[PDB]
């Protein structure tokens, strides 16, 4: 109950500041004020057009590496096992293959951003 | 007469000593620590700020300011 | 508090309805983040802890990549929201109405079958070992390191092979 | 006057003090006059000790300091970034070029004073004004803001 | 001079001690003068619930010694 | 093996991070195999009693099972007390 | 439990309906697959907790591991589609009718 | 030891402005509590140090 | 009483944040041979309040190209998450005692990036989109190693509970056995807080103001309040993990005083670092993390699995 209570208060405080910030100040809306900023000149296109991602391969590698750490985060419970040798070999093998995967991608220039 | 600003390319062999000194410099961020030392040394220096408008920047008799018309 | 888990599973249902309508993937990505959070709460509510926090953490990472991919490869001049198209909005409202109807009718016909609005909160936790110590879900997951090592061998291989797979797919 | 008028007057002071004490100019400089603006930020004068902080975004700026010559080609862009400052906003015209065209007043390519493009609160003379002369003008803007009576005028409407 | 930075630091320092100190004192005030009980595992929760049930006042932190048997 | 020594020396000067990573990885594998304390880690996990030790019915043919927890029979923990 | 599992199965059905009823973006469909994965994760996790089946808790984690591999391949394919056509629209992927 | 010298100069600055009111006046008007030699005063009341 | 305890956490943390804006500006000033604020209040101690009042009295932007729901939500989410990160912190007793408090921190911190991503996207301007896509890259850079660094440390803790770290360090800072991870952890918290030399999502010399460029007035203040609150949080976390403040069961306030001193010091080094270095290029941050930290982090994770087994030093479960 307590965790729910404090997070609601955190939400409540943030939303109150937003309401104050939008209803206290004097406003003056006109078109030139609300147009998008681009260093004093008009944009030549939408900001909604495609924006190329040069690190796209690192990005999807990160998806796999993020499930690798998910497999590592039970380790504090796993070190309590009687089967210490089995746990240790499994953890060593898991870390080593992930290193080999990173090493391969590194030597394939998979960490280099595209030009 | 001229001098080279970045021609220190007398490539030499590396001992264990120098390789370890290079290793320590990379792994322990030693030149980055020297940067922090410099900014730390300024922290304890007296600032150059004057208390304008109670204090003023020095000027000279030649200073060119607001015009006036004079008399005898 | 007797309605707590039903409310959460009801929120989860709405999130998947929003995703199913497929607005711009920007809002689809947001829909999965909220559903992931609601899904974490349900796992917690049933006595979970590690599993709920894992799936939220994994989906927080997963949708960040999808955000990056969306801005590069799945964007239009006017990205669609749930309200932008009257047809999508209507099926959002109709879908929510059909949820209330489906739960209402099923409650009437059986009363204790799939829907048991009279008994909500009485059948969440069934048995609990009151004086136990080693019971948290992380202990169960950790059996991959000792008793279920085959599960970890296949999981590790798929991530390892995945690196070689995605490098091959993406090279020109 | 009344206690409701006294309270309104003290509130004017408080909001005025807040805007005096946190003036954020745009990172915006046109020519040689901008060099003296750098010297006002530099350690001797340290504008930041008065609460004056450059921000690059017009959305996060309160003051525009027109620090240099305003050409015809630049005029629409200067008007754009002025319009994109949220209010309340202020303009300081700095130096002869911005004040009225200066050395280039008679040029085909120059706007004869930025006050043909934006409203101006303070005119700082000089070519360039010294860093200290600019600082004096900034402190004159603060005293102008100290005189604002927007809540008192609202009350008497 | 650098030591003029300290008024802000002291205000920061005071503000960062209050949360730790206030939480420790409010716990003792609301837990019968003792540390708030930590129930990491179900066994600890069971002991608290048993303490609440035998307390006579529905408070786990009101303890009963040999005077009760 | 003078060619490798120059190789390793250059790698140390120029790629020390990778040299440390491989050395640490190799040490982590080696150390459990040569350490005299490796055997105790499993024994300590085995001596932690998370569950109630259910007693056994005495059939008269259990010379090795203690009848009381302070009998001198059963597993001793003196090794851990003086570890 | 009864009502929660009904709602979770409905959540899977909606995500599958989303998968089966394409709009234009391939990425929107890839998100629907992640929705089905998410529903199945919670269903497996809640079942294991409700039955106190601690030996089955590895299985929900393995569901996410292979789903991550499936999602990574899906995104990798989507890069290829976008490179060919400049969008991820599925109507362009029609050369194999003849 | 040298710290004590510094703190004593702080006591001179803090008590050398004409009591508490005089210290508050200069501290809040000028944001400075240094003591200097009085060089003079003009007819308007400005004091030069 | 629990509501009073919420106040005596949130309010002092928000005042500590406000005065960190003052301390930063004075420390940076003095390292630059300036003074910084010394007029608005005695020694500038009212300057934060003036900036706060100014911003909330300013007209907030309603740009025309903006998608307004996410535009409002993102700064709201930013401050909520920043405040929420404090509730499980044991100083030495937390407001909320969590069994997996470290995992709570990672999940909450990981949701915090979406405030940057959505604000930049929702603003629908080019410089804000640039800032959002740098946040995508930033998280990919550091999040890959931050959890493994934590994992290795907590194999000496034996749990994800923050309060257990106090007992783990009863006789020694975790810095001593884990200083190489502490170094990598410290760089990660700089990137995690978008602080210099990794202040890339804002990076004003390149993107004007990046993700928040279209934001004005009070909504802008929420991002700033959230950033300065997080700086204190991450350093307080570094203090509890690696610099175990002295704990005595009969003198809890001693822990709080020692905690504050070390946390104040670690926050000062954040401001000191900002004054000293140039900015990374955002592709270079990715290479720093993935080609230097990640190899060593993986080796050290293997070493810290190996260590408790071969020294028989497995920490207790409870
Ligand atoms: C925060 C409160 C909202 C404040 C927004 C506001 O500033 O006023 C704008 C609005 C005033 O009108 P307006 O400014 O002219 O509208 C123009 C907006 O740009 C037009 O608004 P927009 O471009 O931001 O698009 C609105 C759109 C986008 O808003 C969202 O959906 C994001 C929030 C969803 C949560 O919302 C909807 O389509 C309806 C949302 C229905 C709830 C979603 C249920 C299905 C998803 C289930 C998963 C839950 C997530 O109110
Ligand atoms: C109860 C349902 C509760 C809600 C559950 C929703 C489930 C998730 C929704 C996923 C739907 C989806 O993504 O499809 C996108 C699919 C492709 O969308 P698109 O590529 O963006 O453009 C075509 C659209 O028509 C948009 O382009 P358009 O504007 O040119 O469409 C023209 C036309 C479209 O005509 C429709 O309204 C289609 C719906 C017919 C009514 C169906 C009633 C529900 C049964 O609209 C109308 O003028 C008729 C309005 C009056 C209809 C009443 O859109 C549709 O065809 C309709 C989607 C909504 C239908 C959901 C109902 C699902 C039930 C299964 C139906 C199939 C059964 C066949 C075997 C029997
Ligand atoms: C939503 C209310 C949020 C309140 C947050 C604190 C801000 C209080 C001061 C602003 C009050 C605005 C208001 O409601 O005015 C009445 C509103 C007018 O709002 P308004 O447009 O005048 O708001 C601006 C307020 N001033 C003038 C101070 C800048 O009138 C109505 O009755 C409409 C309902
Ligand atoms: C919320 C936070 C507010 C906390 C700040 C309030 C005080 C600010 C004024 C200040 O400290 O500077 C003094 C200032 C300092 O003088 P100054 O700012 O004009 O001059 C500064 C320049 N030198 C350095 C050369 C002196 O005093 C003044 O003369 C201006 C008066 C401002 C009064 C502020 C409002 C008064 C309180 C009204 C409360 C509302 C009334 C309700 C009925
Ligand atoms: C972390 C910070 C968050 C909180 C931030 C809070 C900061 C605010 C601190 C309190 C001061 C609030 C003052 C309002 C803010 C300024 C807004 C503004 O400038 O709008 C100007 C507007 C402008 O009004 P106008 O009518 O002149 O403008 C008309 C149109 N134009 C602009 C074109 C000229 O004025 C107002 O609306 C003032 C309304 C507020 C009035 C003050 C309260 C009433 C007190 C009555 C006295 C009661 C006495 C009782 C006892 C006897
Ligand atoms: C017995 C078993 C023993 C096993 C343990 C052995 C451990 C050995 C110690 C290794 C510790 C190294 C920590 C990792 C940091 C590192 O070394 O990486 C160096 C990194 C890259 O350096 P770079 O010059 O760019 O060259 C690239 C190729 N190295 O460069 C960097 O990371 C620098 C980044 C710093 C950026 C500025 C941030 C502020 C720095 C000041 C912090 C002050 C506190
Ligand atoms: C985190 C700390 C990482 C480990 C710190 C140890 C690094 C060190 O020893 O600093 C060395 C540096 C001298 O620099 P250098 O000339 O390059 O040294 C030659 C070495 N063969 O030493 C110096 O620069 C002199 C000290 C000046 C800096 C004083 C402030 C110390 C900063 C460290 C605290 C970080 C916060
Ligand atoms: C705006 C959005 C704001 C979202 C803020 C995000 C915060 C990070 C995500 C939080 C999810 C993880 C919460 C958690 O793990 O707490 C579990 C807690 C029980 O803690 P435990 O250590 O297991 O102890 C019980 C046995 N003694 O469980 C409890 O004590 C109560 C049940 C936990 C659920 C609380 C969820 C946070 C509140 C969400 C409010 C709605 C937000 C919209
Ligand atoms: C291709 C991937 C390659 C990377 C993977 C390599 C994995 C190989 C690991 C080799 C190291 C195994 O190290 C092994 O550790 C175990 C405990 O863990 C030690 O085992 C020792 O202690 C255990 C307790 O834990 C006792 O029960 C056992 O009788 C005793 O032998 C072994 O003596 C040692 O040989
Ligand atoms: C997206 C959000 C969706 C919100 C969904 C709706 C939330 C509200 C749930 C309503 C369902 C029934 O909710 C509530 O269930 C409890 C069981 O716990 C019933 O329980 C109570 O009333 C019924 C008889 O009327 C009996 O069981 C008993 O007298 C008492 O326990 C309540 O009468 C009913 O109102
Ligand atoms: C072609 C590719 C496949 C080859 C590569 C994979 C090689 C196999 C490696 C995984 C080995 C798993 O090895 C298997 O481990 C399990 C525990 O996990 C052991 O299981 C044993 O202990 C468990 C503990 O609960 C008992 O319940 C079980 O009855 C008993 O058999 C098996 O006896 C052993 O066969
Ligand atoms: S007024 Fe003088 S100094 Fe300023 S921009 Fe013009 S020419 Fe240069």
From Swiss-Prot, chain B:
Leader peptide range in chain numbering: none
Localization terms from the record: Mitochondrion inner membrane
UniProt-recorded Gene Ontology molecular function terms: 4 iron, 4 sulfur cluster binding; metal ion binding; NADH dehydrogenase (ubiquinone) activity
Disulfides per UniProt: none
Keywords, ordered alphabetically: 4Fe-4S, Electron transport, Iron, Iron-sulfur, Membrane, Metal-binding, Mitochondrion, Mitochondrion inner membrane, NAD, Oxidoreductase, Repeat, Respiratory chain, Transit peptide, Translocase, Transport, Ubiquinone
GO BP of this protein: aerobic respiration; mitochondrial electron transport, NADH to ubiquinone; mitochondrial respiratory chain complex I assembly; proton motive force-driven mitochondrial ATP synthesis
GO terms for cellular component: mitochondrial inner membrane; mitochondrion; respiratory chain complex I
Keyword Chaperone part of the UniProt annotation: no
Subunit structure: Complex I is composed of 45 different subunits. This is a component of the iron-sulfur (IP) fragment of the enzyme. Interacts with RAB5IF.
The protein's role, per its UniProt record: Core subunit of the mitochondrial membrane respiratory chain NADH dehydrogenase (Complex I) which catalyzes electron transfer from NADH through the respiratory chain, using ubiquinone as an electron acceptor. Essential for the catalytic activity and assembly of complex I.
Family: Belongs to the complex I 23 kDa subunit family.
Protein name listed in UniProt: NADH dehydrogenase [ubiquinone] iron-sulfur protein 8, mitochondrial
Species annotation: Mus musculus (Mouse)
Gene label: Ndufs8
Swiss-Prot record, chain F:
Topology in membrane: Single-pass membrane protein
UniProt key word Electron transport: yes
Pfam families reported for this sequence: NADHdh_A3 (PF14987)
Cellular localization per UniProt: Mitochondrion inner membrane
Keywords assigned: Acetylation, Electron transport, Membrane, Mitochondrion, Mitochondrion inner membrane, Respiratory chain, Transmembrane, Transmembrane helix, Transport
Segments of this protein annotated with the region Disordered: 58-83
N-acetylalanine modification, residue list: 1
Record GO cellular component, one term: mitochondrion
GO annotation, biological process: aerobic respiration; proton motive force-driven mitochondrial ATP synthesis
Transmembrane segments: 18-38
Keyword DNA damage assigned: no
Chief location bin: mitochondrion
Similarity-based family: Belongs to the complex I NDUFA3 subunit family.
Role played: Accessory subunit of the mitochondrial membrane respiratory chain NADH dehydrogenase (Complex I), that is believed not to be involved in catalysis. Complex I functions in the transfer of electrons from NADH to the respiratory chain. The immediate electron acceptor for the enzyme is believed to be ubiquinone.
Summary of subunit composition and partner proteins: Complex I is composed of 45 different subunits.
UniProt-recorded name of the protein: NADH dehydrogenase [ubiquinone] 1 alpha subcomplex subunit 3
Species classification: Eukaryota, Metazoa, Chordata, Craniata, Vertebrata
Name of the coding gene: Ndufa3
Swiss-Prot record, chain G:
GO biological process, one term: proton motive force-driven mitochondrial ATP synthesis
Record carries keyword Electron transport: yes
Main localization category: mitochondrion
EC number: 7.1.1.2
Reactions catalysed, as given in the entry: a ubiquinone + NADH + 5 H(+)(in) = a ubiquinol + NAD(+) + 4 H(+)(out)
Any one GO MF annotation of this record: NADH dehydrogenase (ubiquinone) activity
Annotated TM spans: 2-22, 26-46, 58-79
GO cellular component, one term: mitochondrion
Protein's cellular compartments: Mitochondrion inner membrane
Pfam families to which the protein is assigned, alphabetical: Oxidored_q2
This protein's UniProt keywords: Electron transport, Membrane, Mitochondrion, Mitochondrion inner membrane, NAD, Respiratory chain, Translocase, Transmembrane, Transmembrane helix, Transport, Ubiquinone
Topological category with respect to the lipid bilayer: Multi-pass membrane protein
Function: Core subunit of the mitochondrial membrane respiratory chain NADH dehydrogenase (Complex I) which catalyzes electron transfer from NADH through the respiratory chain, using ubiquinone as an electron acceptor. Part of the enzyme membrane arm which is embedded in the lipid bilayer and involved in proton translocation.
Quaternary context: Core subunit of respiratory chain NADH dehydrogenase (Complex I) which is composed of 45 different subunits.
Similarity section: Belongs to the complex I subunit 4L family.
Protein name: NADH-ubiquinone oxidoreductase chain 4L
Phylogenetic lineage: Eukaryota, Metazoa, Chordata, Craniata, Vertebrata
UniProtKB/Swiss-Prot annotation, chain H:
GO BP: aerobic respiration; mitochondrial ATP synthesis coupled electron transport; proton motive force-driven mitochondrial ATP synthesis
Modified residues (N-acetylmethionine): 1
Main location: mitochondrion
UniProt keyword annotations, A-Z: Acetylation, Electron transport, Membrane, Mitochondrion, Mitochondrion inner membrane, Respiratory chain, Transport
Compartment list: Mitochondrion inner membrane
Gene Ontology CC: one annotated term: mitochondrial inner membrane
Disulfide bonding pattern of the chain: none
Function, in words: Accessory subunit of the mitochondrial membrane respiratory chain NADH dehydrogenase (Complex I), that is believed not to be involved in catalysis. Complex I functions in the transfer of electrons from NADH to the respiratory chain. The immediate electron acceptor for the enzyme is believed to be ubiquinone.
Description of how the protein assembles with itself and partners: Complex I is composed of 45 different subunits.
Similarity comment: Belongs to the complex I NDUFA12 subunit family.
Protein name per its UniProtKB record: NADH dehydrogenase [ubiquinone] 1 alpha subcomplex subunit 12
Gene that produces this protein: Ndufa12
Full-sequence range covered: 1 to 49 of 145
């Amino acid at each position: 109950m307590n965790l729910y209570t404090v997070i609601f208060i955190n939400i409540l405080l943030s939303l109150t500041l937003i309401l104050v910030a939008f209803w206290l100040p004097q406003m003056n809306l006109y078109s030139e004020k609300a147009n998008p900023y681009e260093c004093g000149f008009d944009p030549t296109s939408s900001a909604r057009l495609p924006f190329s991602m040069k690190f796209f391969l690192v990005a999807i590698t990160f998806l796999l590496f993020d499930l690798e750490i998910a497999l590592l985060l039970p380790l504090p419970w796993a070190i309590q096992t009687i089967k210490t040798s089995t746990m240790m070999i499994m953890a060593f093998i898991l870390v080593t293959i992930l290193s080999l995967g990173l090493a391969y991608e590194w030597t394939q220039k998979g960490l280099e951003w595209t030009e | 007469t001229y001098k080279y600003v970045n021609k220190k390319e007398q490539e030499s062999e590396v001992d264990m000593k120098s390789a370890t000194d290079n290793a320590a410099r990379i792994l322990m961020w030693t030149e980055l620590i020297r940067g922090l030392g410099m900014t730390l040394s300024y922290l304890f220096r007296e600032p150059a700020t004057i208390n304008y408008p109670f204090e003023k920047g020095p000027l000279s008799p030649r200073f060119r300011g607001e015009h006036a018309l004079r008399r005898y | 508090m007797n309605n707590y888990i039903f409310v959460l599973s009801s929120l989860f249902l709405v999130g998947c309805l929003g995703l199913a309508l497929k607005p711009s993937p920007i809002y689809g990505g947001l829909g999965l983040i909220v559903s992931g959070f609601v899904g974490c709460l349900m796992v917690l509510g049933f006595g979970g802890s590690f599993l709920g926090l894992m799936v939220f953490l994994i989906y927080l990472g997963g949708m960040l990549v999808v955000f990056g991919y969306t801005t590069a490869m799945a964007t239009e001049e006017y990205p669609e929201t749930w309200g932008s198209n009257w047809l999508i909005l209507g099926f959002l409202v109709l879908g929510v109405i059909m949820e209330v109807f489906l739960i209402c009718v099923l409650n009437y016909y059986d009363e204790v079958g799939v829907i048991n609005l009279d008994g909500l909160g009485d059948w969440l936790m069934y048995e609990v070992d009151d004086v136990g110590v080693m019971l948290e879900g992380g202990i169960g997951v950790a059996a991959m390191y000792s008793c279920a090592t085959w599960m970890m061998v296949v999981a590790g291989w798929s991530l390892f092979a995945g690196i070689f797979i995605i490098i091959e797919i993406t090279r020109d | 006057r009344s206690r409701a008028e006294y309270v309104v007057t003290k509130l004017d002071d408080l909001i005025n003090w807040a805007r005096r004490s946190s003036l954020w100019p745009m990172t915006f400089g046109l020519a040689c006059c901008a060099v003296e603006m750098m010297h006002m930020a530099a350690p001797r004068y340290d504008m930041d000790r008065f609460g004056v902080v450059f921000r690059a975004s017009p959305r996060q700026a309160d003051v525009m300091i027109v620090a240099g010559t305003l050409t015809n080609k630049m005029a629409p862009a200067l008007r754009k970034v002025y319009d994109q400052m949220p209010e309340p906003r202020y303009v300081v015209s700095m130096g002869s070029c911005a004040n009225g065209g200066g050395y280039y007043h008679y040029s085909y390519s120059v706007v004869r004073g930025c006050d043909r493009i934006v409203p101006v609160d303070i005119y700082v003379p000089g070519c360039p004004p010294t860093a200290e002369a600019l600082l004096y003008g900034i402190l004159q803007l603060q005293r102008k803001i100290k005189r604002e009576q927007k809540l008192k005028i609202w009350y008497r409407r | 001079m650098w030591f003029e930075i300290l008024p802000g630091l002291a205000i920061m320092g005071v503000c960062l001690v209050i949360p730790g100190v206030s939480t420790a004192y409010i716990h003792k005030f609301t837990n019968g003068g003792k540390e708030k009980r930590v129930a990491r595992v179900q066994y600890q929760w069971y002991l608290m619930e048993r303490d609440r049930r035998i307390s006579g006042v529905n408070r786990y932190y009101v303890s009963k010694g040999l005077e009760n048997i | 093996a003078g060619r490798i020594s120059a190789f390793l020396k250059n790698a140390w000067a120029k790629e020390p991070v990778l040299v440390v990573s491989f050395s640490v990885w190799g040490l982590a594998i080696i150390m459990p195999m040569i350490s005299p304390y490796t055997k105790y880690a499993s024994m300590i996990n085995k001596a932690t009693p998370y569950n109630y030790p259910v007693p056994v019915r005495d059939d008269g043919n259990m010379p090795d099972v203690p009848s009381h927890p302070q009998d001198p029979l059963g597993p001793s923990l003196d090794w851990l007390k003086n570890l | 439990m009864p009502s929660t599992f009904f709602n979770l199965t409905m959540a899977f059905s909606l995500s599958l309906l989303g998968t089966l009823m394409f709009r234009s973006h391939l990425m929107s469909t890839l998100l629907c697959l992640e929705g089905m994965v998410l529903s199945l994760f919670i269903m497996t996790s809640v079942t294991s907790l409700n039955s106190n089946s601690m030996s089955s808790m590895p299985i929900p984690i393995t569901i996410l591991v292979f789903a991550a591999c499936e999602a990574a391949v899906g995104l990798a394919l989507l890069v290829k589609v976008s490179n060919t056509y400049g969008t991820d629209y599925v109507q362009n992927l029609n050369l194999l009718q003849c | 030891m040298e710290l004590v010298e510094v703190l004593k100069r702080g006591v001179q600055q803090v008590t050398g402005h004409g009591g508490l009111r005089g210290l508050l006046r200069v501290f809040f008007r000028a944001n400075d509590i240094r003591i200097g030699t009085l060089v003079g005063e003009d007819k308007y009341g400005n004091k030069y140090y | 009483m629990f509501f009073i305890n919420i106040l005596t956490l949130l309010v002092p943390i928000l005042i500590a944040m406000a005065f960190l804006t003052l301390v930063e500006r004075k420390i940076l000033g003095y390292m630059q041979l300036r003074k910084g604020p010394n007029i608005v209040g005695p020694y500038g101690i009212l300057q934060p309040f003036a900036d706060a009042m100014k911003l909330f009295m300013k007209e907030p932007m309603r740009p025309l190209t903006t998608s307004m729901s996410l535009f409002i939500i993102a700064p709201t989410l930013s401050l909520t998450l920043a405040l929420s990160l404090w509730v499980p912190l044991p100083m030495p007793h937390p407001l909320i005692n969590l069994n997996l408090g470290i995992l709570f921190i990672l999940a909450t911190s990981s949701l915090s990036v979406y405030s940057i991503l959505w604000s930049g996207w929702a603003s629908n301007s080019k410089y804000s989109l640039f800032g959002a896509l740098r946040a995508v890259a930033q998280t990919i850079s550091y999040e890959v190693t931050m959890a493994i660094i934590l994992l290795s440390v907590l194999l000496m803790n034996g749990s994800y509970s923050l309060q257990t770290l106090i007992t783990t360090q009863e006789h020694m800072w975790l810095l001593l056995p884990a200083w190489p991870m502490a170094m990598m952890w410290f760089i990660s918290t700089l990137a995690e807080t978008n602080r210099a030399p990794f202040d890339l999502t804002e990076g004003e010399s390149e993107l004007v103001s990046g993700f928040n460029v279209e934001y004005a007035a009070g909504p802008f203040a929420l991002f700033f309040m959230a950033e300065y609150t997080n700086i204190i949080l991450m350093n307080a976390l570094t203090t509890i993990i690696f610099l175990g403040p002295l704990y005595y069961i009969n003198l809890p306030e001693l822990y709080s005083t020692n905690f504050m001193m070390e946390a104040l010091l670690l926050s000062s080094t954040f401001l000191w670092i900002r004054a000293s270095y140039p900015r990374f290029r955002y592709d270079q941050l990715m290479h720093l993390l993935w080609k230097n930290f990640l190899p060593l982090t993986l080796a050290l994770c293997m070493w810290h699995i190996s260590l408790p087994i071969f020294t028989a030093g497995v920490p207790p479960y409870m």
